Write an enzyme that holds these catalytic residues in place. Structure first.
Site, PDB file in Angstrom:
ATOM      1  N   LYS A 165       0.837  -1.194   0.000  1.00  0.00           N
ATOM      2  CA  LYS A 165       0.000   0.000   0.000  1.00  0.00           C
ATOM      3  C   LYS A 165       0.872   1.245   0.000  1.00  0.00           C
ATOM      4  O   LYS A 165       1.819   1.346   0.788  1.00  0.00           O
ATOM      5  CB  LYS A 165      -0.939   0.028   1.213  1.00  0.00           C
ATOM      6  CG  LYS A 165      -1.949  -1.108   1.339  1.00  0.00           C
ATOM      7  CD  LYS A 165      -3.060  -0.991   0.293  1.00  0.00           C
ATOM      8  CE  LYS A 165      -2.808  -1.772  -0.971  1.00  0.00           C
ATOM      9  NZ  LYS A 165      -3.967  -1.701  -1.899  1.00  0.00           N
ATOM     10  N   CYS A 222     -11.243 -19.837  11.200  1.00  0.00           N
ATOM     11  CA  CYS A 222     -12.628 -19.781  10.750  1.00  0.00           C
ATOM     12  C   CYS A 222     -12.865 -18.560   9.870  1.00  0.00           C
ATOM     13  O   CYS A 222     -11.916 -17.972   9.345  1.00  0.00           O
ATOM     14  CB  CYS A 222     -13.576 -19.772  11.949  1.00  0.00           C
ATOM     15  SG  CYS A 222     -13.596 -21.302  12.918  1.00  0.00           S
ATOM     16  N   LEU A 261     -44.593 -57.199  19.145  1.00  0.00           N
ATOM     17  CA  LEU A 261     -44.812 -56.269  20.244  1.00  0.00           C
ATOM     18  C   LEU A 261     -46.146 -55.556  20.062  1.00  0.00           C
ATOM     19  O   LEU A 261     -46.750 -55.610  18.990  1.00  0.00           O
ATOM     20  CB  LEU A 261     -43.654 -55.277  20.312  1.00  0.00           C
ATOM     21  CG  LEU A 261     -42.332 -55.833  20.839  1.00  0.00           C
ATOM     22  CD1 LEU A 261     -41.291 -54.741  20.915  1.00  0.00           C
ATOM     23  CD2 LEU A 261     -42.526 -56.475  22.200  1.00  0.00           C
ATOM     24  N   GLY A 317     -48.760 -52.913  19.051  1.00  0.00           N
ATOM     25  CA  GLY A 317     -48.718 -51.926  17.992  1.00  0.00           C
ATOM     26  C   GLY A 317     -47.838 -52.278  16.817  1.00  0.00           C
ATOM     27  O   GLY A 317     -47.527 -51.396  16.013  1.00  0.00           O
ATOM     28  N   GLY A 356     -48.590 -54.446  14.367  1.00  0.00           N
ATOM     29  CA  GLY A 356     -49.336 -54.903  13.216  1.00  0.00           C
ATOM     30  C   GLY A 356     -49.506 -56.397  13.109  1.00  0.00           C
ATOM     31  O   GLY A 356     -49.681 -56.902  11.997  1.00  0.00           O
ATOM     32  N   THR A 411     -51.889 -58.547  13.729  1.00  0.00           N
ATOM     33  CA  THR A 411     -53.089 -59.021  13.048  1.00  0.00           C
ATOM     34  C   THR A 411     -53.105 -58.593  11.585  1.00  0.00           C
ATOM     35  O   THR A 411     -53.704 -59.276  10.746  1.00  0.00           O
ATOM     36  CB  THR A 411     -54.335 -58.517  13.778  1.00  0.00           C
ATOM     37  OG1 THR A 411     -54.281 -58.928  15.149  1.00  0.00           O
ATOM     38  CG2 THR A 411     -55.600 -59.084  13.153  1.00  0.00           C
TER      39      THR A 411
HETATM   40 MG   LIG Z   1      -1.987  -4.026  -4.900  1.00  0.00          MG
HETATM   41 ZN   LIG Z   2     -12.263 -20.906  15.582  1.00  0.00          ZN
END
Ligand SMILES: [Mg+2]
Ligand SMILES: [Zn+2]
Ligand SMILES: [Mg+2]
Ligand SMILES: [Zn+2]
EC number: 3.1.-.-
Lengths: 827, 827
Positions: B181, B287, B528, B530, B532, B534
């Site tokens: 810069k 991150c 068991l 419930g 099914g 039957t």
């Molecule tokens: Mg540059």
């Molecule tokens: Zn982190």
């Protein structure tokens, strides 16, 4: 044109002199700058589409420079991302500037097939109308567009008019369906010729539209062109010629061309003709319309070539092992597990053979491997032959090094210095690296270096540090691609991986089968040939002791043959006895019984089924486990076995998946099983052979099957002896080979005659089926080898007393072979 | 600011006065143009992220105009595609210009959930270094970047220097890790404020880098700034504050701030101090680092609001029914099957009630439906109540029209005209349209029109033609999203859809279970509550008839209770009789026997198990099928059942997945099953109750379970009558309700008592358990209802003579209810 230079184990493209640096590229004229940029981008696109490589360019200055903003932006457009580092890395040395290009898509089955396009392009030449503008589709947009196409108005009032007044105002503006173009008389034929390829394809690709030529864009005024210059008949011919010249690719029937309606209307000024106005209605096209061929490039052979429109569409819309890809992580840990702390040499058997034959080879390898302290060094007598290349006399061995903090290196070891040795090693390192990407699916940055070592006492390119293997994650990911690459060729390591795939298929079927232990106490297992029936029986007895907490001596294994008894008894998972032993002795202490090859049992010595039922039912845990494994296709006699009638053999489990034999062997088994069904033996029950294999089940393992006939017995032995020597030279062990004859009485005859020919091959040690732990070739009868298996099996003179049993020995013989089967029938 | 207009059944945003047309916008000043464009894209982004809507703007012109190139390009950047038509469609009438916006991502579980981002943004504020440039990541790039961050040098030599000579040439150029810069003294402090948020987040997001301030870009000369103006202590503080101000989001622990090293060095000219140079080394961040808050917008309530940095990251990285989504096509074809040729009114049962109660409603609906020839008209008493809104008195019914060549229309019928009628329908049509997108995952263009009809004898927008239902494919897809929406609410059609999910779950378990017919002849099924049990027994008899090709009367069904026997006989799949009838009558003609509720059998009438074995084994096809179904949780007595000991009950099958009861009912059963395990009955063998449900199995069907205790018998029957009246008013049928008592002797008492309280609800008829086909409420005891099932069950005072059998009575009662269970225990 661009040519790949063949002095490198990689794709290296020389683009020549290039101006680099932003301040230097600013001073160039637009033409020269654009030509240089286009050359560099052609090279980069070719390397992206061809598996990666290096772009070599010569810079005009000594000091380090940046590449330039326009080149950066063109690369960004090429990969459609600002993450320029993921695919490109730059190096420079003096007068040379290198760009290392990574492959765009890797493998035949990438993990992103339905997500990312398979190709990169400089332009797709696919345009579409985007409101009042025409935009070219990028690779992702074109991918989605072709995916969509592959799946199975106030403007019309003006178009209906026969004439237009000069200066008339069109009420509608430019829109998704309307385009206004002003027609200049000085270049009117040229202007209309270049307007057609840019707006007609855009309209056809999205819903059609109207193209008005002769209407002012800003003021919507109808002006047209001069009447003296435009010929309505000649102008019509030019427009239709251009529209029908546009390339089109169809995914449908019919394949009708582009449909349009062209009208030339007079422009009347004060009631007098002033000129013509060109109005075109473009109907939507069924498929993709190209303005020209796509600007995509690829390397094939030694040239950088551009993809044709039909080939580009094919790749954009669309031996490889599916089993190798699925189990690549399991397979790598079995064979190519990297050890932490030292360098591992594989295969160890081949390594011992090499250092014994060649004096000083071990010191040459050890002195070379000092810098590397972790990794694996994979040996082969010729890595070129493993990859379907040509064998080079004078090469001792080829070693591939995959170590930490190093790039992969291929070592070619020569007995004497050779001029062509470097070309041989570079050609093999090139082939291996390209297979690791295009075949093994390696998505990282990979390079294979080519190094030649000589036993008797062009510059190497410097890759970025991202090409070195950083740790376990990189080495394991690279070795999992080598597993896939190896499984697609024929070699020792390919055969070692093929055996493990068959072990993983068996382990998959066992878990489904092992769920029957909780549900059954008595079970009859009707497993087809090659279905792993003996392997399941061994694993079940491992589960029985775990689940029922009984001791190993509480589980009894009963089999007809002694060689199978010995094999099971050596595993220390149960007690193994023969049927004749079972009837004689007393087994009151036994809780669980597993019976195998029960169809081979005989009633002449007593009722074995009643005794087995009696012992398990009187056991402490009510009815104990009594599982009976049998195969009616492998019946060895026409006598009664002593099993209960076929209707009384319940409950049943059926093993219909062939998981122990390779693909050529399995297809031979299904073929021969169909013959048995066409003529079942009389002793066998009627409907038991109606068990059919899975509708579409494949092993995904390569194999070998040759049937050689009309040879004399002496010629048979030489073919066996020569074949074994070729196997043993590549590193196969003698304990992978079995020779099976028709009857046990001919074992002594064939043993003498085989040893006569095999003595010339430095092999004079043969064993029978009763010994399978020794490192020797087993020679025995087909029936005596029941339940056992070898990788390589030679079938010599199948024979039996009754031709009804004759098709059984072929099934019995072929199921003993895992990968390689050689049959020598009578003639 | 932007505010949502509330008088529409859609999200409508008024952005006010906007200049449209390219020529009109070019004449504007830059600031006004950018402000108008930014307002328009705020509205567009909000509608994209909020389920779609309309942007309303007033244009300064009467004639139709184009939108403008800058607006087009901004929309293209917003959706990252040139396919502007898929999300935006424009209209204009007079002085108003409408943009119709489609939802970007619809549904909580999109198909592209792992591919495309969920949000659109004007900016992500995520910059990264791209060679020698800083580029912002668009939504796709930022999505992939955050996905990657979620998973678990020659420049350094100069950096070590303490002083630098003025005019010194730096050897290295600008690169991925180096930025220069130029530092001007006029705005030296202002320059630092702006450069830090641009380059530091870019370096931190990609591998770190070096930022040199005071070096010329072109010539790489070290210049620095004036010594008189620079305060090196003040300058250091300014940089430190700016770096720590950058918003950071962590996907890990720890959460340390950005790591960097800031160095101020002196610039010396001719051996004399000239000024200071700033050098910053930025370490890579674990991150995502943001330069500022993301520029993404969403509609919350009636305001257009911007998402915070942590809320934006949450959406970009990360009652809903899983079962409804997976079964949406089968569920739609069951209830909302679209018929070709005529308009279908559903439900038929509710439609008949509406026209009978209301005079003239039939002709009013038929008059409106004449333009519509194909589709479905879905009725409800209050569509607002179905969607958890408040009911409005005076509303007769609501209807949702889904017809071809039309948009979805929500009709609200009023008994007299009301001012609030149009507000009630618009709020329901708005809620429905937002549910179809945000909950049902509709990916097309959808609008629900709000129309109000009065039985006693703001302007709607004209949507584009792409919002109409073109044919079967558009209508079916919308009806599949309504299935997903309905299943997440409590309503009639939700319960009809919930019952069908239970039938699809039961059919899935039967396909797994039906594979045992080829493997077993005698089988004991331990299901068991419930599970099914039957239902499976009935389905097997269909397969027995098909597989064994025997006629229906050759199959015998034996049960313990009469009401279950008549239920099976009515289906004509077999001969069905009771245990006592089985032991008396002769059944020599029977081949296969299926026994259900075998734990409820009794010994004193004879030895039924031996007779079952004798009949099946002596059959023509050897041993016939002998399957016995039993559950030890519904043991209704303490005597001996006649079953063989548990060790002799092999082979065995177990149904452990509960597929017949809703989630509240299923959870109650598991809790009640746990109590039985801790206190097994003495008649049950020891190891029976050790059957455990599936480790993690859910029904995905919502239901109702309430316990109302300490009520008197008179109080109980009023609550049953009030609840039954509420269900029947909403459109449920009497055949969905059963009232189960403790003992059959009290049935005659409670029947009179209930009818006393129920007569005020205009039904004076009850049916018995032996009659299930009538449209009447069934009242009987728990024991006599074994094997049967109803959608709504009222359990009154569970009682038995032995408190040991009492905890089973809750299981025998609760398992009879599919969706709604009301229990009234003893006080
Ligand atoms: Mg540059
Ligand atoms: Zn982190
Ligand atoms: Mg134009
Ligand atoms: Zn076509």
């Amino acid at each position: 044109p661009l040519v790949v230079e063949p002095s490198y184990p990689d794709l290296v493209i020389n683009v020549g002199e290039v101006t680099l640096g932003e301040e230097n590229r600013k001073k160039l004229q637009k033409i020269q700058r654009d030509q240089e940029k286009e050359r560099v981008m052609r090279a980069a696109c070719a390397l992206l589409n061809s598996g990666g490589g290096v772009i070599r360019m010569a810079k005009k200055v000594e000091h380090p420079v940046e590449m330039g903003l326009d080149l950066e932006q063109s690369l960004r457009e090429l990969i459609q991302s600002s993450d320029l580092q993921a695919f490109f890395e730059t190096k420079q040395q003096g007068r040379c500037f290198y760009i290392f290009v990574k492959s765009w898509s890797s493998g035949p089955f990438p993990e992103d097939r339905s997500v990312k396009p398979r190709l990169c392009s400089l332009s797709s030449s696919l345009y579409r109308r985007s409101e009042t503008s025409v935009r070219s589709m990028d690779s992702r947009e074109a991918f989605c567009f072709l995916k969509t196409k592959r799946k199975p108005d106030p403007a019309d009032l003006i178009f209906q008019k026969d004439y237009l007044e000069y200066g008339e105002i069109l009420p509608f503006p430019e829109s998704q369906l309307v385009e206004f173009k002003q027609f200049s008389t000085k270049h009117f034929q040229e202007y209309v010729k270049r307007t057609i390829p840019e707006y007609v394809p855009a309209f056809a690709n999205t819903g059609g539209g109207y193209l008005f030529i002769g209407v002012d864009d800003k003021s919507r005024e109808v002006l047209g062109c001069a009447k003296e210059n435009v010929d309505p008949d000649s102008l019509r011919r030019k427009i239709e010629q251009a529209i029908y010249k546009l390339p089109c690719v169809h995914f449908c029937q019919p394949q009708r061309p582009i449909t349009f309606t062209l009208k030339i209307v007079n422009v009347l000024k004060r009631g007098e003709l002033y000129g013509y106005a060109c109005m075109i209605r473009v109907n939507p096209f069924c498929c993709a319309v190209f303005s020209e061929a796509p600007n995509s490039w690829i390397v094939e052979d030694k040239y950088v070539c551009s993809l044709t429109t039909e080939k580009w569409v094919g790749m954009m819309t669309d031996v490889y092992s599916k089993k190798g890809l699925e189990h690549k992580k399991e397979l790598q840990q079995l064979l190519f597990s990297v050890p932490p702390g030292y360098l591992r040499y594989t295969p160890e058997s081949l390594w011992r053979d090499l250092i014994s034959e060649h004096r000083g080879l071990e010191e040459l390898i050890n002195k070379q491997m000092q810098p590397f302290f972790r990794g694996i060094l994979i040996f082969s007598r010729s890595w070129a032959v493993d990859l379907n290349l040509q064998e080079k006399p004078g090469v001792i061995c080829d070693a591939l090094l995959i170590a930490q903090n190093s790039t992969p290196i291929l070592y070619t070891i020569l007995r004497e210095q050779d001029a062509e040795g470097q070309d041989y090693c570079t050609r093999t390192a090139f082939t291996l690296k390209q297979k690791l990407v295009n075949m093994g699916g390696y998505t990282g940055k990979v390079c294979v270096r080519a190094k030649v070592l000589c036993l008797s006492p062009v510059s190497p390119m410097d890759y970025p540090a991202s090409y070195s293997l950083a740790g376990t994650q990189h080495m394991e990911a690279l070795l999992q691609s080598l597993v896939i690459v190896l499984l697609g060729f024929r070699s020792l390591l390919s055969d070692q991986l093929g055996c493990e795939v068959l072990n993983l298929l068996t382990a998959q079927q066992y878990e489904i089968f092992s769920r029957s232990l909780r549900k059954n106490r008595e079970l009859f297992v009707h497993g087809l040939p090659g279905s792993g029936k003996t392997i399941m029986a061994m694993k079940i007895m491992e589960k029985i002791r775990n689940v029922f907490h009984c001791e190993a001596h509480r589980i009894l294994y009963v089999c007809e043959n002694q060689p199978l008894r010995n094999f099971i008894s050596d595993r220390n998972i149960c007690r193994a006895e023969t049927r004749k032993t079972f009837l004689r002795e007393n087994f009151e202490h036994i809780q669980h019984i597993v019976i195998d090859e029960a169809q081979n049992f005989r009633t002449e010595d007593g009722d074995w089924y009643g005794k087995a039922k009696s012992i398990t039912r009187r056991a402490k845990g009510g009815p104990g486990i009594l599982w009976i494994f049998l195969d009616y296709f492998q019946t060895s006699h026409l006598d009664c076995s002593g099993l209960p009638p076929l209707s009384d053999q319940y409950p049943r489990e059926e093993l219909t998946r062939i998981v122990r034999n390779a693909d050529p062997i399995a297809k031979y088994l299904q073929k021969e099983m169909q013959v048995i069904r066409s003529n079942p033996s009389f002793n066998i029950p009627t409907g038991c052979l109606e068990v059919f294999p899975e509708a579409e089940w494949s092993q995904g393992v390569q194999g070998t099957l040759r049937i050689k006939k009309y040879l004399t017995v002496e010629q048979i032995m030489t073919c066996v002896a020569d074949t074994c020597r070729r196997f043993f030279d590549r590193g196969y062990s003698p304990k992978d080979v079995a020779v099976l004859v028709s009857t046990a009485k001919e074992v002594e005859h064939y043993k003498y005659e085989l040893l006569k020919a095999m003595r010339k091959k430095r092999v004079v040690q043969l064993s029978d089926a009763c010994d399978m732990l020794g490192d020797h070739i087993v020679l025995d009868s087909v029936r005596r080898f029941s339940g056992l298996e070898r990788s390589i099996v030679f079938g010599i003179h199948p024979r039996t007393a009754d031709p009804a049993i004759l098709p059984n020995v072929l099934i019995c013989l072929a199921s003993r072979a895992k990968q390689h089967l050689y049959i020598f029938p009578w003639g």
